[PDB]
Amino acid sequence: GLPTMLTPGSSQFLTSDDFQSPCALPNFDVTPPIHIPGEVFNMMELAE
Amino acid sequence: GLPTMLTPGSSQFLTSDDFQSPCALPNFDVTPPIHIPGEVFNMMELAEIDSMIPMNSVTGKANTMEMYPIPLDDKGSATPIFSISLSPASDKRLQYTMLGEILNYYTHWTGSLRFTFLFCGSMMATGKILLSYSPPGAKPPTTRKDAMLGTHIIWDLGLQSSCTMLAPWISNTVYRRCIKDDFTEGGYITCFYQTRIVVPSGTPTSMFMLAFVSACPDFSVRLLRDTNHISQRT
Amino acid sequence: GLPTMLTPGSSQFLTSDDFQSPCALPNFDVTPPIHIPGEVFNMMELAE
Amino acid sequence: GAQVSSQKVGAHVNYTTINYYKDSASNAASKLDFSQDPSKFTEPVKDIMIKTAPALN
Amino acid sequence: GAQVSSQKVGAHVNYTTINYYKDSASNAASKLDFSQDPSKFTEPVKDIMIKTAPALN
Amino acid sequence: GAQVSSQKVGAHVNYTTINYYKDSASNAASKLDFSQDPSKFTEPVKDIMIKTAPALN
Amino acid sequence: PTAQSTPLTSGVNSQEVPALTAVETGASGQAVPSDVIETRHVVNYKTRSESTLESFFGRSACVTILEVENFNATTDADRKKQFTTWAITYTDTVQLRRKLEFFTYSRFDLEMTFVITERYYASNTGHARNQVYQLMYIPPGAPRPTAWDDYTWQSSSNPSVFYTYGSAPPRMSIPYVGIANAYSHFYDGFARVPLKDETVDSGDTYYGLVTINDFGTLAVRVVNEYNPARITSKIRVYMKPKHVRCWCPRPPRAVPYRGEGVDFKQDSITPLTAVENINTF
Amino acid sequence: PTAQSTPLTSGVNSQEVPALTAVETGASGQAVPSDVIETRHVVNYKTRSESTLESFFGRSACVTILEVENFNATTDADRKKQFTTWAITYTDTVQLRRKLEFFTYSRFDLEMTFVITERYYASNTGHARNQVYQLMYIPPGAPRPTAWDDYTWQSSSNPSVFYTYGSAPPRMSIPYVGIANAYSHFYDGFARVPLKDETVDSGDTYYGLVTINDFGTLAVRVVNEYNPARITSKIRVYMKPKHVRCWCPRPPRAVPYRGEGVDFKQDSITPLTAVENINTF
Amino acid sequence: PTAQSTPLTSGVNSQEVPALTAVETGA
Amino acid sequence: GYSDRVRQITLGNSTITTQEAANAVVAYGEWPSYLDDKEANPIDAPTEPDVSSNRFYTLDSVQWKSTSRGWWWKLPDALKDMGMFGQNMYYHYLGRSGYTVHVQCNASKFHQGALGVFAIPEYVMACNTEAKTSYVSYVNANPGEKGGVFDNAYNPSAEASEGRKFAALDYLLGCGVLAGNAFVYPHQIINLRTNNSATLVLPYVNSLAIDCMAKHNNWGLVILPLCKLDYAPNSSTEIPITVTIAPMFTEFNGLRNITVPATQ
Ligand SMILES: [Ca+2]
Ligand SMILES: [Ca+2]
Ligand SMILES: [Ca+2]
Ligand SMILES: [Ca+2]
Ligand SMILES: [Ca+2]
Ligand SMILES: [Ca+2]
Ligand SMILES: [Ca+2]
Ligand SMILES: [Ca+2]
Ligand SMILES: [Ca+2]
Ligand SMILES: [Cl-]
Ligand SMILES: [Cl-]
Ligand SMILES: [Cl-]
Ligand SMILES: [Cl-]
Ligand SMILES: [Cl-]
Ligand SMILES: [Cl-]
Structure with missing residues (x-):
């Protein structure tokens, strides 16, 4: 194997992490999107 | 998965490591920077600033403002005015200078040291003063005739108030240690009246000078360490 | 994370290994080298 | 396969991403989307209102 | 995405860095910055002082 | 950043190295150095000695 | 870039007098050895790499020690031992604090690392399954836990790290989060202006950074329910400033601290050891 | 590059006499087989790869064994068992030392690796939770611990490694840290010059490298507080010189060491076993 | 993209009255 | 003719002369300036009082004696009651200012002594009770033009309420x-x-x-x-x-x- 060395943080679950993960339902065909009125992109839109 | 194999060191926490780690506050918008005066980039910038040596830290004067001024008078004694070893991290008087404090976060130092003296007598006081640096390995100088055989400067008191004596880098090792150590001893700094201080009548016959120390541009430090100058109970 | 799989040998300390490891004194400025007489490169030089 | 993108700036560069999985659902967070149109909620009026003009004329 | 930079020399090369995270705060240490200007602390005087000249004329 | 070098031959190729650390002290072993000059120890004489000639003439 | 080389110089007999100056000007001495002695040429290959700010601060330093326990708590006092909260600061310890306080202002990102250790409280109560810890960062305003298993730990928005005992020390980066353009290590002021003839108390108010600083709270619990064996844990918190800038240097702390402020203690204000004589080598 | 091939040569009858020389000159014998016998051609494909300095020194060698314990200490002696300090050296063991001492001077970076092992002191005092160790490098001048839990272990500037029992042996690299341009394995001198008529003691002073060497101190503790079960640990320290240069070869150590110096022991200065006769095959 | 910057502006004395509106409109 | 010892400084309707100066310091090598749009924060058009407030104000003098241990002031506190500067300061929530500080002390060619004159950013000082930390009253922290004095002794109070001042050691x-x-x-x-x-x-x-x-x-x-x-x-x-x-x-x-x- 490729020699590797684990660093601090290894195996932790940080709730604000941003990693990839395997999909439990591979090659699932999501329902096609349609246009719905009232899309929001930013909470500051609501603050205005 | 990609075949891998863990090596020694795996899972350790080395406090001087330098790794990436996930951010707890992703896509956080930091406050924009603005220019602030007095930015510092290197601790050696601070080491090049003059700070006052507590040269007269004798009993009754140590830990008072009177620890700094070096007593002078018009009597022309042959006894040295002050004497101190070139041990800038460990000496009882140099360790608490700004340079000394910075040195105590490091293990090794190298370069030339600058000693600047400010005469604070009256304008009517005149005098000539010998300032000497004797590299180590011989009898420590306690008389002017031994001191003047080393590196030295004769300072004439006058309109220009201050004189700089250098302890040039003269060492066997490439670095000295920031501790008291015979192998990396630095030598001896002394001071004598070359003539004497002379004053006319109606003038103080005793007065002071202030001594400052700073690092030269050839100076550098290595090997970060904890200082012995701060602690706490547990 | 990148999917990986540990192989035999993982976590062992082989005394003849040859791996990188983190430096305890980062950005340390080593004493400059100077020429010293009598450099040796191979134990067989001494055997001759 | 590698995508190189700008990082969110810190106190004082780019970063690299490779997708390892065949399903987009496995991917990390969507890239920052600064899109907005507050007017669909703050001013959903049929006839344009010019601020400097009277709202009712 | 890979940056190749000079290493700090040892007893007797280059190294490679790739940033894995979208926030610069996650990055390893800043590269060595040898910038300095001691004069802002050691000589913050309005009028230039030439060493070889008298400080006060 | 990757260096490709010849391996030491076995019973019957090249290998790849990337340095991961900013200090050269962190690096793996120095590459094989076959330098030698036994004469500095075996024949450190001022005047050249030709083997086939008399050592003392 | 290297520290300064020394040029070859001989003597002088001249109206140029670099040895004299006037430090009344506010300038430090500037002369170097070539100004006052004969020098050889020496090429200086040495660098100031290890005294850059990044190098000086490039260490994880312990800033506090927290304690939490896991056991069947039947009193209010024992229930409060099942979790702990800590106002985030660097003033519980002295070493990193003193280094930061060489400067008035700073700006940096932060690497936080944790070391978690356990011991058995006693040996006649069986054993305990491996424990998972939750370390939750509670920004100012977010609800603080009053019990180890209350609703706050669901942590929908606060960052939490779940750490499994025996795993590598957990670690995360924090951006520069100051509400000013730099952090202030010293603040010569107050949080509000007391006004003429107001009825607000002026006898028990404080001064300086303590009146304005708030970096939130770290809350820690053992996620597991109790075993028959009581387990006591310590959590050591480490901080490393990285991507560092600093401004406005200061003399370093010369005497012991006695709290979060600059105050000093009467029995500990004599740092110098007196020398026998002014002429002591 | 390979070791020398042998050329095809026949006999001679000549005034060229490579078989004779004069080693009084300081030159070793130089003749090779083709100078004194008839030889065939043999192509030599073999190399001196494994006797380069890097190859000769390319091993992690144990240089010391340290001990630390974790238990409820109620006496000064037992409190001192909760941590240990060790002046860093290669003279506690003999094998690496002897190899280094083929040379007068060296220059290398160092890989340090540690092997940490535990056992229970007894079996009637329950069990112990998994332990974390701190190994702190204390450079000369930095404060040394007097207790396992004093302030020095916060290690703001000293490098420390925190190791979790059962994990891979911890490891770090150290640069060439000598204050000279090479390390000296031998130093024929003193740390200071004793001067005429001085009152300094000359009866109890030492000689050689011991008077000038100082590579700092390794301090080790178990970070955990005590369990009811006392745990005793050993820490084996390993050194591998890498990126190696050496100068000025020496005869290797022929008799047992008896300390850090070159001194020898009266009962152990007869390395050769006598042969029965000068004619013994 | 950033939040809105503020332009340099002085005073007014004008028939343009941006301070008044009519929120009955739903705006 | 021109000299490091002789200087004139004019700001607004006020001028200082000195014939025995020693150059002048510009702290951190940076002259004061107005706040640039790219570093601005509050968005209201600022008041820039210029000559009404940017002028020399002379504080009450203090007496240097052989027994004096020193003096301190804070800024902008020392000028809070000074003409239009003080008015502009107190009518606004926010303010910024640079300064020219000119310290004056003449004697004779037969006197001797030396004063260190330091400008310290964020000059936070210790309190005078060990029952509390950071325990200083607003009134004692902000003495105005009278400033304060240093002492060569530290005598913290018996009761916390009596030690809410600086221990200016x-x-x-x-x-x-x-x-x-x-x-x-x-x-x-x-x-x-x-x-x-x-x-x-x-x-x-x-x-x-x-x-x-x-x-x-x-x-x-x-x-x-x-x-x-x-x-x-x-x-x-x-x-x-x-x-x-x-x-x-x-x-x-x-x-x-x-x-x-x-x-x-
Ligand atoms: Ca309108
Ligand atoms: Ca000059
Ligand atoms: Ca011959
Ligand atoms: Ca240079
Ligand atoms: Ca010269
Ligand atoms: Ca061959
Ligand atoms: Ca032949
Ligand atoms: Ca904008
Ligand atoms: Ca105006
Ligand atoms: Cl929960
Ligand atoms: Cl009032
Ligand atoms: Cl559970
Ligand atoms: Cl600790
Ligand atoms: Cl513990
Ligand atoms: Cl006032």
Whole structure:
């Protein structure tokens, strides 16, 4: 194997992490999107 | 998965490591920077600033403002005015200078040291003063005739108030240690009246000078360490 | 994370290994080298 | 396969991403989307209102 | 995405860095910055002082 | 950043190295150095000695 | 870039007098050895790499020690031992604090690392399954836990790290989060202006950074329910400033601290050891 | 590059006499087989790869064994068992030392690796939770611990490694840290010059490298507080010189060491076993 | 993209009255 | 003809001359300036009072004696009651200012002594009770033009309520650091044999572009006798030290009714 060395943080679950993960339902065909009125992109839109 | 194999060191926490780690506050918008005066980039910038040596830290004067001024008078004694070893991290008087404090976060130092003296007598006081640096390995100088055989400067008191004596880098090792150590001893700094201080009548016959120390541009430090100058109970 | 799989040998300390490891004194400025007489490169030089 | 993108700036560069999985659902967070149109909620009026003009004329 | 930079020399090369995270705060240490200007602390005087000249004329 | 070098031959190729650390002290072993000059120890004489000639003439 | 080389110089007999100056000007001495002695040429290959700010601060330093326990708590006092909260600061310890306080202002990102250790409280109560810890960062305003298993730990928005005992020390980066353009290590002021003839108390108010600083709270619990064996844990918190800038240097702390402020203690204000004589080598 | 091939040569009858020389000159014998016998051609494909300095020194060698314990200490002696300090050296063991001492001077970076092992002191005092160790490098001048839990272990500037029992042996690299341009394995001198008529003691002073060497101190503790079960640990320290240069070869150590110096022991200065006769095959 | 910057502006004395509106409109 | 010893400074309707100066310090090498649009924060059009407020104000003089341990002031506190500067300061929530500080002390060619004159950013000082930390009253922290004095003794109070003032211990610079290291701060020395004045030009220094002047002092001004005053014919003689300070590049935001701080 490729020699590797684990660093601090290894195996932790940080709730604000941003990693990839395997999909439990591979090659699932999501329902096609349609246009719905009232899309929001930013909470500051609501603050205005 | 990609075949891998863990090596020694795996899972350790080395406090001087330098790794990436996930951010707890992703896509956080930091406050924009603005220019602030007095930015510092290197601790050696601070080491090049003059700070006052507590040269007269004798009993009754140590830990008072009177620890700094070096007593002078018009009597022309042959006894040295002050004497101190070139041990800038460990000496009882140099360790608490700004340079000394910075040195105590490091293990090794190298370069030339600058000693600047400010005469604070009256304008009517005149005098000539010998300032000497004797590299180590011989009898420590306690008389002017031994001191003047080393590196030295004769300072004439006058309109220009201050004189700089250098302890040039003269060492066997490439670095000295920031501790008291015979192998990396630095030598001896002394001071004598070359003539004497002379004053006319109606003038103080005793007065002071202030001594400052700073690092030269050839100076550098290595090997970060904890200082012995701060602690706490547990 | 990148999917990986540990192989035999993982976590062992082989005394003849040859791996990188983190430096305890980062950005340390080593004493400059100077020429010293009598450099040796191979134990067989001494055997001759 | 590698995508190189700008990082969110810190106190004082780019970063690299490779997708390892065949399903987009496995991917990390969507890239920052600064899109907005507050007017669909703050001013959903049929006839344009010019601020400097009277709202009712 | 890979940056190749000079290493700090040892007893007797280059190294490679790739940033894995979208926030610069996650990055390893800043590269060595040898910038300095001691004069802002050691000589913050309005009028230039030439060493070889008298400080006060 | 990757260096490709010849391996030491076995019973019957090249290998790849990337340095991961900013200090050269962190690096793996120095590459094989076959330098030698036994004469500095075996024949450190001022005047050249030709083997086939008399050592003392 | 290297520290300064020394040029070859001989003597002088001249109206140029670099040895004299006037430090009344506010300038430090500037002369170097070539100004006052004969020098050889020496090429200086040495660098100031290890005294850059990044190098000086490039260490994880312990800033506090927290304690939490896991056991069947039947009193209010024992229930409060099942979790702990800590106002985030660097003033519980002295070493990193003193280094930061060489400067008035700073700006940096932060690497936080944790070391978690356990011991058995006693040996006649069986054993305990491996424990998972939750370390939750509670920004100012977010609800603080009053019990180890209350609703706050669901942590929908606060960052939490779940750490499994025996795993590598957990670690995360924090951006520069100051509400000013730099952090202030010293603040010569107050949080509000007391006004003429107001009825607000002026006898028990404080001064300086303590009146304005708030970096939130770290809350820690053992996620597991109790075993028959009581387990006591310590959590050591480490901080490393990285991507560092600093401004406005200061003399370093010369005497012991006695709290979060600059105050000093009467029995500990004599740092110098007196020398026998002014002429002591 | 390979070791020398042998050329095809026949006999001679000549005034060229490579078989004779004069080693009084300081030159070793130089003749090779083709100078004194008839030889065939043999192509030599073999190399001196494994006797380069890097190859000769390319091993992690144990240089010391340290001990630390974790238990409820109620006496000064037992409190001192909760941590240990060790002046860093290669003279506690003999094998690496002897190899280094083929040379007068060296220059290398160092890989340090540690092997940490535990056992229970007894079996009637329950069990112990998994332990974390701190190994702190204390450079000369930095404060040394007097207790396992004093302030020095916060290690703001000293490098420390925190190791979790059962994990891979911890490891770090150290640069060439000598204050000279090479390390000296031998130093024929003193740390200071004793001067005429001085009152300094000359009866109890030492000689050689011991008077000038100082590579700092390794301090080790178990970070955990005590369990009811006392745990005793050993820490084996390993050194591998890498990126190696050496100068000025020496005869290797022929008799047992008896300390850090070159001194020898009266009962152990007869390395050769006598042969029965000068004619013994 | 950033939040809105503020332009340099002085005073007014004008028939343009941006301070008044009519929120009955739903705006 | 021109000399490092002779200087004129004019700001607004005020001028200073000195014939025994020693150059002048510009703190951290930076002259004060107005706040740039790219570093701005409050968005209201600021008041820039210019000559009405950016001018020399002379404080009450203090007396240097052989027994004096030193003096301190804070800025903008020391100028809070000074003409239109004070009015602009208190009518606004926010303000920023640089300064020209001119310290004046003449004697004779037969007197001796040396004053260290230091400008210290965020000059936080120790309190005088060990029952609390950071326990200083607003009134004691903000003495105004009278400033305060240093002492060579530390005598913390028996009761917390009586120690809500600074422990201005000279050799610890009133803040737990050694006074010999104060030279890391912008400074000059008035050494009586050499010079009779010190001049320091200070930019605005803070971690913010602009701040609440009534809450927060940006600079401390410290005058310490490094070498005691001595005069052979009368060791008990006293000579004045006079401090004159001009705000520079003043800028204020957040106008409302006037701030009137508590006085007791
Ligand atoms: Ca309108
Ligand atoms: Ca000059
Ligand atoms: Ca021959
Ligand atoms: Ca150079
Ligand atoms: Ca010269
Ligand atoms: Ca061959
Ligand atoms: Ca032959
Ligand atoms: Ca904008
Ligand atoms: Ca105006
Ligand atoms: Cl939960
Ligand atoms: Cl559970
Ligand atoms: Cl600790
Ligand atoms: Cl513990
Ligand atoms: Cl006032
Ligand atoms: Cl009031």
